[PDB]
Amino acid sequence: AKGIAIALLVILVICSLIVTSVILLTPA
Amino acid sequence: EGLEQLEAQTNFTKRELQVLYRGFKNECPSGVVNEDTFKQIYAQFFPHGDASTYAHYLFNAFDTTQTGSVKFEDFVTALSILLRGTVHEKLRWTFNLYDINKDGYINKEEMMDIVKAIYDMMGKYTYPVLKEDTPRQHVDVFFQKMDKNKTLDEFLESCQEDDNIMRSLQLFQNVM
Amino acid sequence: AAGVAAWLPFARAAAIGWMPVASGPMPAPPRQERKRTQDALIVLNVSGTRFQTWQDTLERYPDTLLGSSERDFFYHPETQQYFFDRDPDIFRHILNFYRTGKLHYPRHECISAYDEELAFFGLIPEIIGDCCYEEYKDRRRENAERLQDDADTDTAARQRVWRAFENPHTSTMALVFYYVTGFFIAVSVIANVVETVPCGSSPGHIKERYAVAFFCLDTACVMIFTVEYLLRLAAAPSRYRFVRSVMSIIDVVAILPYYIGLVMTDNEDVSGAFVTLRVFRVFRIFKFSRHSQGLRILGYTLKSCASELGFLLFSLTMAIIIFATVMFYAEKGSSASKFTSIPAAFWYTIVTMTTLGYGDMVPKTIAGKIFGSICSLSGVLVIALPVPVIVSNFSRIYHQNQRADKRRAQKKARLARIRAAKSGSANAYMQSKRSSSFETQHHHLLHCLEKTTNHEFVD
């Protein structure tokens, strides 16, 4: 149960990091 | 009919006949048993493994004319010839049961699926630990007891040439 | 027919009516017996109580078990009474049928038992009298749907993940994927609504924010969506029938607008189509269907009551047409007279049929208020007509779901009990190997199986 919640934490932080990279690269 | 079928089509007493009929009817009130009831009853007798295919073979032997569901007449006739007839009738029934098709000769695969229907009955809780090795030693030994030439008459004469198989039949003949 | 034997002499008597006109050999009665009646009260005891009846009464229906010569299987000789081993109550109704010919069916009886006892005696269900037949058929229907729910479902390589893909509460990966895709749907729709907000994509400060990054923020989600749909195209039990379903239709309707907009902006700049793309950029709300258990229930509720909703629409068009026409013809001659056309009175009558009320346009003539009020009342009636049906269907469907879940738990318990029973029989045989009448021959046959394969049984 809670391990799946940690898996959510991992995937959400990964996608947040990648979308942050995407938003940070464009406004050059 | 039950009023004239006293011994004309059976070797059963009137009381035994009617009690067997009631036992049959309590399971299949429609009066005709299908193959699913066969799996149910046969498995319920052996609540330790799976023997659906052996029951399939038994019904196919029982189901004459390939009707798909045997009535009581043929069922009681088969019981009478199996349990209170002559040994020749039992051997003829073994012919019919083992002859999964309408052929004359008996090949390897028939003993294959029969021995599988026998070996799957146990399960995986036996000391010798049965595997695929044992069934075809058994079938091979049957084959050396069978004719060397590549026979129903030979199987018959082998049946009346061995005493153990002959005495393996009366012990059910007398009782019930 | 064959059930009117008691009137057989009367027909014989009727023959005398045509003797003067008769011209023939008159084949004479065929050696009938017992001219005077010697009918004896045959007694049928059914595991207990006994029912006494005549023989001609019992034999007027030879197709059944109590007729014909089949009953002689159950004759019990040393007492001279048929000892049927059946239920001592339903047999009363069967005897009643033999007496009349129209079998009945009381309510306080289990269908499985009643039908078993009815088929045992060779009777067929359709003989039931019309008076009880409706209630019989309703009971048979509910028991049939019970057994349908009994037979529906069981739990069972690269194609195996499909099992976890329709029950995401099965594996860690399936559940995390379900939760994260739900979050992605939510963040996509929130991204849309916050693109619309003035602080998001409007000139909040012309001279100075309008972050166009939303143009990318949605894109990933669409890409994300593709992968699971691709999985649906990989672990597909049906390559085309799966598409034939509606959930895949919602998925593709969600996916397409992004791609079609990309293709357009690569080739065209049609005015009025980009706004349509924005409008269609919201149906992931329906993509939420899998997460929401009640959404499928609501959809099935609407699908079930299709006729009622159709009649709703028809009656609404009825009332709108009639009352809008009345309004236009009774209010076009006013000073302001905003009722400029029947297509404009449509809006007034649809906002007064729904008991909504805006006051942008209201009647101003005595000829207008009367039909306005009548329209409001008729709107209450018409809209209230189908809602009880819809809500009753929804409640029924929710009940079916909950009872199906409880039934599945019960089925799991029953299969566990059967496994336990087999284990107990095996252990009993083990104990017999270590050291009731039936068990003797049962264990004897088990020993015969043991010896025919020369392999013994262990714990």
Side-chain angles (χ1 to χ4, degrees), chain C residues 12-67:
Chain C
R12 282 209 213 278
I16 300 315
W18 63 65
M19 294 298 102
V21 194
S23 302
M26 295 298 102
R31 54 178 275 264
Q32 48 85 21
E33 326 174 6
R34 56 186 71 261
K35 293 181 183 291
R36 65 166 303 163
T37 50
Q38 277 66 241
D39 49 356
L41 278 298
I42 201 156
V43 294
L44 310 174
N45 72 327
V46 288
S47 86
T49 179
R50 54 142 180 86
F51 306 93
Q52 315 211 352
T53 183
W54 306 108
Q55 179 44 236
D56 69 327
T57 293
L58 183 63
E59 199 50 37
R60 43 179 60 170
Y61 287 64
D63 291 331
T64 82
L65 190 138
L66 295 201

Short mmCIF file of all heavy atoms in Angstrom, two decimals, chain C residues 12-67:
data_model
loop_
_atom_site.label_atom_id
_atom_site.label_comp_id
_atom_site.label_asym_id
_atom_site.label_seq_id
_atom_site.Cartn_x
_atom_site.Cartn_y
_atom_site.Cartn_z
N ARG C 12 -70.23 -41.23 -25.66
CA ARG C 12 -70.93 -42.43 -26.10
C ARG C 12 -72.42 -42.15 -26.23
O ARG C 12 -73.04 -42.48 -27.25
CB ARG C 12 -70.68 -43.57 -25.11
CG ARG C 12 -69.33 -44.25 -25.26
CD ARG C 12 -69.40 -45.70 -24.83
NE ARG C 12 -68.16 -46.15 -24.22
CZ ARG C 12 -67.10 -46.56 -24.91
NH1 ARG C 12 -67.10 -46.57 -26.23
NH2 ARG C 12 -66.02 -46.97 -24.25
N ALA C 13 -72.99 -41.50 -25.22
CA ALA C 13 -74.40 -41.14 -25.28
C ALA C 13 -74.68 -40.24 -26.48
O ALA C 13 -75.69 -40.41 -27.17
CB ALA C 13 -74.82 -40.46 -23.98
N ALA C 14 -73.78 -39.29 -26.75
CA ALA C 14 -73.97 -38.40 -27.88
C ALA C 14 -74.07 -39.18 -29.19
O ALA C 14 -74.71 -38.71 -30.14
CB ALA C 14 -72.84 -37.38 -27.95
N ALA C 15 -73.46 -40.36 -29.25
CA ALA C 15 -73.54 -41.17 -30.46
C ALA C 15 -74.99 -41.48 -30.82
O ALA C 15 -75.36 -41.48 -32.00
CB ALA C 15 -72.74 -42.46 -30.30
N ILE C 16 -75.83 -41.70 -29.80
CA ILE C 16 -77.23 -42.02 -30.04
C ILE C 16 -77.92 -40.92 -30.82
O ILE C 16 -78.94 -41.15 -31.49
CB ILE C 16 -77.94 -42.30 -28.69
CG1 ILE C 16 -77.26 -43.47 -27.97
CG2 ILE C 16 -79.41 -42.61 -28.89
CD1 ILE C 16 -76.97 -44.65 -28.86
N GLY C 17 -77.37 -39.71 -30.79
CA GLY C 17 -77.94 -38.61 -31.55
C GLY C 17 -77.94 -38.83 -33.05
O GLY C 17 -78.78 -38.26 -33.75
N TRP C 18 -77.01 -39.64 -33.57
CA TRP C 18 -76.89 -39.83 -35.01
C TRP C 18 -77.11 -41.27 -35.45
O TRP C 18 -76.74 -41.64 -36.56
CB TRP C 18 -75.54 -39.32 -35.51
CG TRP C 18 -74.35 -40.06 -34.97
CD1 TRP C 18 -74.02 -41.36 -35.19
CD2 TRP C 18 -73.33 -39.53 -34.12
NE1 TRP C 18 -72.86 -41.68 -34.53
CE2 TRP C 18 -72.42 -40.57 -33.86
CE3 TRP C 18 -73.10 -38.28 -33.55
CZ2 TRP C 18 -71.30 -40.40 -33.06
CZ3 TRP C 18 -71.99 -38.11 -32.75
CH2 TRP C 18 -71.10 -39.16 -32.52
N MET C 19 -77.71 -42.10 -34.59
CA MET C 19 -78.03 -43.46 -35.00
C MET C 19 -78.99 -43.52 -36.19
O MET C 19 -78.74 -44.32 -37.11
CB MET C 19 -78.58 -44.25 -33.80
CG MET C 19 -77.56 -44.47 -32.70
SD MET C 19 -76.14 -45.44 -33.25
CE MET C 19 -74.89 -44.19 -33.48
N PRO C 20 -80.08 -42.75 -36.25
CA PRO C 20 -80.94 -42.83 -37.44
C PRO C 20 -80.23 -42.50 -38.73
O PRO C 20 -80.52 -43.10 -39.77
CB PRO C 20 -82.06 -41.82 -37.13
CG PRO C 20 -82.09 -41.74 -35.65
CD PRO C 20 -80.66 -41.87 -35.22
N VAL C 21 -79.28 -41.55 -38.70
CA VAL C 21 -78.55 -41.20 -39.91
C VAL C 21 -77.38 -42.15 -40.15
O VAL C 21 -76.81 -42.16 -41.25
CB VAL C 21 -78.07 -39.74 -39.81
CG1 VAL C 21 -77.61 -39.23 -41.17
CG2 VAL C 21 -79.18 -38.87 -39.27
N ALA C 22 -77.01 -42.95 -39.15
CA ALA C 22 -75.87 -43.84 -39.29
C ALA C 22 -76.12 -44.91 -40.34
O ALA C 22 -77.25 -45.40 -40.50
CB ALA C 22 -75.54 -44.49 -37.95
N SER C 23 -75.07 -45.27 -41.07
CA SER C 23 -75.13 -46.35 -42.06
C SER C 23 -73.73 -46.98 -42.11
O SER C 23 -72.85 -46.51 -42.83
CB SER C 23 -75.56 -45.84 -43.42
OG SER C 23 -76.83 -45.20 -43.34
N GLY C 24 -73.55 -48.05 -41.34
CA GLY C 24 -72.27 -48.71 -41.25
C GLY C 24 -72.29 -49.97 -40.41
O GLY C 24 -73.29 -50.33 -39.79
N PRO C 25 -71.15 -50.68 -40.38
CA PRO C 25 -71.09 -51.95 -39.64
C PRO C 25 -71.07 -51.80 -38.12
O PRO C 25 -71.28 -52.81 -37.44
CB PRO C 25 -69.78 -52.58 -40.14
CG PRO C 25 -68.97 -51.44 -40.63
CD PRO C 25 -69.93 -50.43 -41.17
N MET C 26 -70.85 -50.59 -37.58
CA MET C 26 -70.85 -50.37 -36.13
C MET C 26 -69.89 -51.31 -35.42
O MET C 26 -70.33 -52.29 -34.80
CB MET C 26 -72.27 -50.53 -35.58
CG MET C 26 -73.25 -49.48 -36.07
SD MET C 26 -72.80 -47.80 -35.61
CE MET C 26 -72.11 -47.18 -37.15
N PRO C 27 -68.58 -51.05 -35.48
CA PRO C 27 -67.58 -52.05 -35.08
C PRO C 27 -67.69 -52.61 -33.66
O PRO C 27 -66.93 -53.51 -33.31
CB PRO C 27 -66.25 -51.30 -35.26
CG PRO C 27 -66.61 -49.86 -35.25
CD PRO C 27 -67.96 -49.78 -35.88
N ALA C 28 -68.60 -52.07 -32.85
CA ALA C 28 -68.93 -52.58 -31.51
C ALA C 28 -67.78 -52.37 -30.53
O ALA C 28 -66.61 -52.36 -30.93
CB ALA C 28 -69.32 -54.06 -31.58
N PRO C 29 -68.07 -52.20 -29.24
CA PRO C 29 -67.02 -51.89 -28.27
C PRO C 29 -65.95 -52.97 -28.23
O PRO C 29 -66.25 -54.16 -28.34
CB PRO C 29 -67.78 -51.81 -26.94
CG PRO C 29 -69.15 -51.42 -27.33
CD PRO C 29 -69.41 -52.11 -28.64
N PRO C 30 -64.68 -52.58 -28.08
CA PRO C 30 -63.55 -53.52 -28.13
C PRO C 30 -63.18 -54.15 -26.78
O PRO C 30 -62.22 -53.77 -26.11
CB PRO C 30 -62.41 -52.65 -28.66
CG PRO C 30 -62.73 -51.27 -28.16
CD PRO C 30 -64.22 -51.19 -27.91
N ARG C 31 -63.97 -55.15 -26.40
CA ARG C 31 -63.74 -56.02 -25.23
C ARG C 31 -63.24 -55.24 -24.01
O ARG C 31 -62.17 -55.50 -23.47
CB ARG C 31 -62.79 -57.17 -25.58
CG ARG C 31 -61.44 -56.78 -26.19
CD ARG C 31 -60.56 -57.99 -26.44
NE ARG C 31 -59.81 -58.38 -25.25
CZ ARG C 31 -58.56 -58.01 -25.01
NH1 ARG C 31 -57.89 -57.25 -25.86
NH2 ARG C 31 -57.96 -58.42 -23.89
N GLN C 32 -64.06 -54.29 -23.57
CA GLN C 32 -63.75 -53.57 -22.35
C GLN C 32 -64.00 -54.45 -21.13
O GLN C 32 -64.79 -55.40 -21.18
CB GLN C 32 -64.58 -52.29 -22.25
CG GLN C 32 -66.06 -52.48 -22.53
CD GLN C 32 -66.82 -52.92 -21.30
OE1 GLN C 32 -66.38 -52.72 -20.17
NE2 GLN C 32 -67.98 -53.54 -21.51
N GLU C 33 -63.32 -54.14 -20.04
CA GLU C 33 -63.40 -54.92 -18.81
C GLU C 33 -64.12 -54.13 -17.72
O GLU C 33 -64.30 -52.91 -17.82
CB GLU C 33 -62.01 -55.32 -18.33
CG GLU C 33 -61.01 -55.60 -19.45
CD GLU C 33 -59.61 -55.85 -18.93
OE1 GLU C 33 -59.44 -55.93 -17.69
OE2 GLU C 33 -58.69 -55.98 -19.76
N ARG C 34 -64.54 -54.86 -16.68
CA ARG C 34 -65.13 -54.32 -15.45
C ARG C 34 -66.17 -53.24 -15.76
O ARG C 34 -65.98 -52.05 -15.52
CB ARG C 34 -64.05 -53.82 -14.48
CG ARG C 34 -63.06 -52.78 -14.98
CD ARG C 34 -61.97 -52.51 -13.95
NE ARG C 34 -61.06 -53.64 -13.81
CZ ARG C 34 -61.13 -54.55 -12.85
NH1 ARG C 34 -62.07 -54.51 -11.92
NH2 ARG C 34 -60.23 -55.53 -12.82
N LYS C 35 -67.28 -53.71 -16.34
CA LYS C 35 -68.39 -52.82 -16.69
C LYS C 35 -68.77 -51.92 -15.52
O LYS C 35 -68.92 -50.70 -15.68
CB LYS C 35 -69.60 -53.65 -17.13
CG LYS C 35 -69.41 -54.41 -18.44
CD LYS C 35 -70.68 -55.18 -18.79
CE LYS C 35 -70.50 -56.01 -20.05
NZ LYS C 35 -70.36 -55.17 -21.27
N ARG C 36 -68.94 -52.50 -14.33
CA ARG C 36 -69.13 -51.71 -13.13
C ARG C 36 -67.78 -51.30 -12.55
O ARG C 36 -66.79 -52.03 -12.64
CB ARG C 36 -69.95 -52.49 -12.10
CG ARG C 36 -69.27 -53.73 -11.57
CD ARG C 36 -69.96 -54.25 -10.32
NE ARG C 36 -70.01 -53.25 -9.26
CZ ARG C 36 -70.82 -53.30 -8.21
NH1 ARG C 36 -71.66 -54.31 -8.04
NH2 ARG C 36 -70.78 -52.32 -7.31
N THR C 37 -67.75 -50.11 -11.95
CA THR C 37 -66.49 -49.51 -11.55
C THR C 37 -65.92 -50.18 -10.30
O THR C 37 -66.60 -50.28 -9.28
CB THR C 37 -66.67 -48.01 -11.30
OG1 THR C 37 -67.80 -47.80 -10.44
CG2 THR C 37 -66.90 -47.28 -12.62
N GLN C 38 -64.67 -50.63 -10.40
CA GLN C 38 -63.91 -51.17 -9.28
C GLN C 38 -62.63 -50.38 -9.07
O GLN C 38 -61.55 -50.94 -8.86
CB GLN C 38 -63.60 -52.65 -9.49
CG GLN C 38 -64.73 -53.59 -9.10
CD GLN C 38 -65.94 -53.43 -9.99
OE1 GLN C 38 -67.02 -53.09 -9.52
NE2 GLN C 38 -65.77 -53.69 -11.28
N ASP C 39 -62.73 -49.06 -9.14
CA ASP C 39 -61.58 -48.20 -8.89
C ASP C 39 -61.18 -48.26 -7.43
O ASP C 39 -62.02 -48.13 -6.53
CB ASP C 39 -61.90 -46.77 -9.32
CG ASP C 39 -63.23 -46.27 -8.78
OD1 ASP C 39 -63.94 -47.06 -8.13
OD2 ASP C 39 -63.56 -45.09 -9.01
N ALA C 40 -59.89 -48.45 -7.18
CA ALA C 40 -59.36 -48.59 -5.83
C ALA C 40 -58.51 -47.37 -5.50
O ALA C 40 -57.84 -46.81 -6.38
CB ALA C 40 -58.52 -49.86 -5.69
N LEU C 41 -58.54 -46.95 -4.24
CA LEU C 41 -57.81 -45.76 -3.83
C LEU C 41 -56.32 -46.06 -3.78
O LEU C 41 -55.83 -46.62 -2.80
CB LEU C 41 -58.28 -45.27 -2.46
CG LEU C 41 -59.54 -44.41 -2.44
CD1 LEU C 41 -59.30 -43.15 -3.23
CD2 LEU C 41 -60.75 -45.16 -2.94
N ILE C 42 -55.60 -45.69 -4.82
CA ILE C 42 -54.16 -45.86 -4.83
C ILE C 42 -53.54 -44.79 -3.94
O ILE C 42 -53.92 -43.61 -3.99
CB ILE C 42 -53.61 -45.84 -6.27
CG1 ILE C 42 -52.25 -46.51 -6.34
CG2 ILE C 42 -53.52 -44.43 -6.82
CD1 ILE C 42 -51.94 -47.01 -7.73
N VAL C 43 -52.61 -45.21 -3.09
CA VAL C 43 -52.02 -44.33 -2.09
C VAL C 43 -50.57 -44.06 -2.47
O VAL C 43 -49.82 -44.98 -2.79
CB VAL C 43 -52.12 -44.93 -0.67
CG1 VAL C 43 -53.57 -45.01 -0.25
CG2 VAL C 43 -51.50 -46.31 -0.64
N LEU C 44 -50.20 -42.78 -2.45
CA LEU C 44 -48.87 -42.32 -2.79
C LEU C 44 -48.33 -41.60 -1.57
O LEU C 44 -48.77 -40.50 -1.26
CB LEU C 44 -48.91 -41.38 -3.99
CG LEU C 44 -49.69 -41.87 -5.21
CD1 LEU C 44 -49.77 -40.78 -6.25
CD2 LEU C 44 -49.04 -43.10 -5.78
N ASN C 45 -47.40 -42.22 -0.86
CA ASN C 45 -46.76 -41.55 0.26
C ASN C 45 -45.41 -41.02 -0.21
O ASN C 45 -44.67 -41.73 -0.90
CB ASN C 45 -46.62 -42.47 1.47
CG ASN C 45 -45.58 -43.54 1.29
OD1 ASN C 45 -45.36 -44.03 0.19
ND2 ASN C 45 -44.93 -43.93 2.38
N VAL C 46 -45.13 -39.78 0.12
CA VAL C 46 -43.94 -39.09 -0.36
C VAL C 46 -43.09 -38.75 0.87
O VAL C 46 -43.19 -37.67 1.45
CB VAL C 46 -44.29 -37.85 -1.18
CG1 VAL C 46 -44.85 -38.28 -2.50
CG2 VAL C 46 -45.35 -37.04 -0.48
N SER C 47 -42.22 -39.68 1.24
CA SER C 47 -41.36 -39.55 2.41
C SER C 47 -42.15 -39.05 3.61
O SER C 47 -41.84 -38.02 4.21
CB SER C 47 -40.18 -38.62 2.12
OG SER C 47 -40.55 -37.27 2.34
N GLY C 48 -43.21 -39.77 3.94
CA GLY C 48 -44.06 -39.34 5.03
C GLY C 48 -45.54 -39.44 4.73
O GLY C 48 -46.07 -40.54 4.54
N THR C 49 -46.21 -38.29 4.71
CA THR C 49 -47.66 -38.26 4.52
C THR C 49 -48.06 -38.96 3.23
O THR C 49 -47.26 -39.12 2.30
CB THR C 49 -48.16 -36.82 4.50
OG1 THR C 49 -49.57 -36.82 4.28
CG2 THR C 49 -47.48 -36.05 3.39
N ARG C 50 -49.32 -39.37 3.17
CA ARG C 50 -49.85 -40.14 2.06
C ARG C 50 -51.02 -39.42 1.42
O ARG C 50 -51.88 -38.87 2.12
CB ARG C 50 -50.28 -41.53 2.51
CG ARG C 50 -51.25 -41.53 3.68
CD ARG C 50 -52.30 -42.61 3.52
NE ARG C 50 -53.25 -42.62 4.63
CZ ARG C 50 -54.33 -41.86 4.70
NH1 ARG C 50 -54.65 -41.02 3.73
NH2 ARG C 50 -55.12 -41.96 5.76
N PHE C 51 -51.06 -39.43 0.09
CA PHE C 51 -52.16 -38.88 -0.68
C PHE C 51 -52.89 -40.02 -1.37
O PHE C 51 -52.27 -40.82 -2.08
CB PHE C 51 -51.66 -37.87 -1.72
CG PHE C 51 -50.81 -36.78 -1.14
CD1 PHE C 51 -49.44 -36.90 -1.11
CD2 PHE C 51 -51.39 -35.63 -0.65
CE1 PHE C 51 -48.66 -35.90 -0.58
CE2 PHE C 51 -50.62 -34.62 -0.12
CZ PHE C 51 -49.25 -34.76 -0.09
N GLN C 52 -54.20 -40.10 -1.18
CA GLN C 52 -55.01 -41.14 -1.79
C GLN C 52 -55.73 -40.56 -2.99
O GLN C 52 -56.33 -39.48 -2.89
CB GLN C 52 -56.01 -41.71 -0.79
CG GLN C 52 -55.42 -42.00 0.58
CD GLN C 52 -56.08 -43.17 1.26
OE1 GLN C 52 -57.09 -43.68 0.78
NE2 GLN C 52 -55.52 -43.60 2.38
N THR C 53 -55.69 -41.27 -4.11
CA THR C 53 -56.40 -40.82 -5.30
C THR C 53 -56.75 -42.03 -6.15
O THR C 53 -56.21 -43.12 -5.97
CB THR C 53 -55.57 -39.82 -6.10
OG1 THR C 53 -56.35 -39.36 -7.22
CG2 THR C 53 -54.31 -40.48 -6.61
N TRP C 54 -57.68 -41.82 -7.08
CA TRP C 54 -58.11 -42.88 -7.96
C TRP C 54 -57.00 -43.26 -8.93
O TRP C 54 -55.91 -42.69 -8.92
CB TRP C 54 -59.35 -42.45 -8.73
CG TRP C 54 -60.45 -41.98 -7.86
CD1 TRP C 54 -60.88 -40.70 -7.71
CD2 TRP C 54 -61.28 -42.78 -7.02
NE1 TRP C 54 -61.92 -40.65 -6.81
CE2 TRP C 54 -62.19 -41.92 -6.38
CE3 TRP C 54 -61.34 -44.15 -6.75
CZ2 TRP C 54 -63.15 -42.38 -5.48
CZ3 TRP C 54 -62.30 -44.60 -5.86
CH2 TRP C 54 -63.18 -43.72 -5.24
N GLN C 55 -57.28 -44.26 -9.76
CA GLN C 55 -56.32 -44.65 -10.79
C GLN C 55 -56.58 -43.93 -12.11
O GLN C 55 -55.63 -43.49 -12.77
CB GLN C 55 -56.37 -46.16 -10.99
CG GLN C 55 -55.44 -46.68 -12.07
CD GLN C 55 -54.06 -46.05 -12.01
OE1 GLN C 55 -53.59 -45.47 -12.98
NE2 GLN C 55 -53.42 -46.17 -10.85
N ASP C 56 -57.85 -43.81 -12.51
CA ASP C 56 -58.17 -43.08 -13.73
C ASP C 56 -57.77 -41.61 -13.61
O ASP C 56 -57.31 -41.00 -14.58
CB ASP C 56 -59.66 -43.20 -14.04
CG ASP C 56 -60.52 -42.47 -13.04
OD1 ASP C 56 -60.14 -42.41 -11.86
OD2 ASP C 56 -61.59 -41.94 -13.44
N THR C 57 -57.94 -41.03 -12.42
CA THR C 57 -57.50 -39.66 -12.20
C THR C 57 -55.99 -39.55 -12.36
O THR C 57 -55.50 -38.57 -12.93
CB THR C 57 -57.93 -39.19 -10.81
OG1 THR C 57 -59.36 -39.10 -10.76
CG2 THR C 57 -57.33 -37.84 -10.48
N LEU C 58 -55.25 -40.53 -11.87
CA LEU C 58 -53.80 -40.47 -11.93
C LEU C 58 -53.25 -40.82 -13.30
O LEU C 58 -52.09 -40.49 -13.60
CB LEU C 58 -53.20 -41.39 -10.87
CG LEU C 58 -51.69 -41.43 -10.70
CD1 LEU C 58 -51.20 -40.07 -10.27
CD2 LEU C 58 -51.30 -42.47 -9.68
N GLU C 59 -54.04 -41.47 -14.16
CA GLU C 59 -53.55 -41.96 -15.44
C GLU C 59 -54.04 -41.15 -16.63
O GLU C 59 -53.77 -41.54 -17.77
CB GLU C 59 -53.93 -43.44 -15.60
CG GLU C 59 -53.11 -44.20 -16.64
CD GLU C 59 -51.61 -44.02 -16.46
OE1 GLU C 59 -51.15 -43.96 -15.30
OE2 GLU C 59 -50.90 -43.93 -17.48
N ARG C 60 -54.74 -40.04 -16.42
CA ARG C 60 -55.23 -39.27 -17.56
C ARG C 60 -54.13 -38.49 -18.26
O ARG C 60 -54.39 -37.93 -19.33
CB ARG C 60 -56.34 -38.32 -17.12
CG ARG C 60 -56.07 -37.60 -15.83
CD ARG C 60 -57.21 -36.67 -15.47
NE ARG C 60 -58.46 -37.39 -15.33
CZ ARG C 60 -59.57 -36.86 -14.83
NH1 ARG C 60 -59.62 -35.60 -14.43
NH2 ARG C 60 -60.66 -37.61 -14.74
N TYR C 61 -52.92 -38.44 -17.71
CA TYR C 61 -51.79 -37.71 -18.30
C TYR C 61 -50.63 -38.69 -18.43
O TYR C 61 -49.72 -38.70 -17.59
CB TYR C 61 -51.41 -36.50 -17.46
CG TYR C 61 -52.39 -35.36 -17.55
CD1 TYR C 61 -53.69 -35.50 -17.08
CD2 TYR C 61 -52.03 -34.14 -18.10
CE1 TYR C 61 -54.59 -34.47 -17.16
CE2 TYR C 61 -52.93 -33.10 -18.18
CZ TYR C 61 -54.21 -33.28 -17.71
OH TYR C 61 -55.11 -32.25 -17.79
N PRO C 62 -50.62 -39.51 -19.48
CA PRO C 62 -49.65 -40.61 -19.56
C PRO C 62 -48.23 -40.17 -19.84
O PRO C 62 -47.31 -40.99 -19.71
CB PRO C 62 -50.19 -41.47 -20.70
CG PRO C 62 -50.91 -40.51 -21.57
CD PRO C 62 -51.47 -39.43 -20.68
N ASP C 63 -48.00 -38.91 -20.23
CA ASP C 63 -46.66 -38.46 -20.57
C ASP C 63 -45.78 -38.23 -19.35
O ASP C 63 -44.57 -38.06 -19.50
CB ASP C 63 -46.74 -37.17 -21.39
CG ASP C 63 -47.32 -37.40 -22.76
OD1 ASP C 63 -47.15 -38.51 -23.30
OD2 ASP C 63 -47.95 -36.47 -23.31
N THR C 64 -46.35 -38.22 -18.15
CA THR C 64 -45.62 -37.90 -16.94
C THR C 64 -45.20 -39.17 -16.21
O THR C 64 -45.50 -40.29 -16.63
CB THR C 64 -46.47 -37.01 -16.03
OG1 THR C 64 -47.38 -37.84 -15.29
CG2 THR C 64 -47.27 -36.03 -16.86
N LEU C 65 -44.49 -38.98 -15.10
CA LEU C 65 -43.97 -40.13 -14.36
C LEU C 65 -45.07 -40.81 -13.55
O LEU C 65 -45.09 -42.04 -13.43
CB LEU C 65 -42.83 -39.70 -13.45
CG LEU C 65 -42.06 -40.85 -12.80
CD1 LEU C 65 -40.57 -40.57 -12.84
CD2 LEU C 65 -42.52 -41.05 -11.38
N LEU C 66 -45.98 -40.04 -12.97
CA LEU C 66 -47.09 -40.64 -12.23
C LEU C 66 -48.07 -41.34 -13.15
O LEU C 66 -48.83 -42.20 -12.69
CB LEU C 66 -47.81 -39.59 -11.40
CG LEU C 66 -46.97 -38.97 -10.28
CD1 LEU C 66 -47.86 -38.36 -9.23
CD2 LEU C 66 -46.07 -40.03 -9.67
N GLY C 67 -48.08 -40.99 -14.43
CA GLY C 67 -48.77 -41.77 -15.44
C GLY C 67 -47.86 -42.85 -15.99
O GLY C 67 -46.83 -43.20 -15.41
#
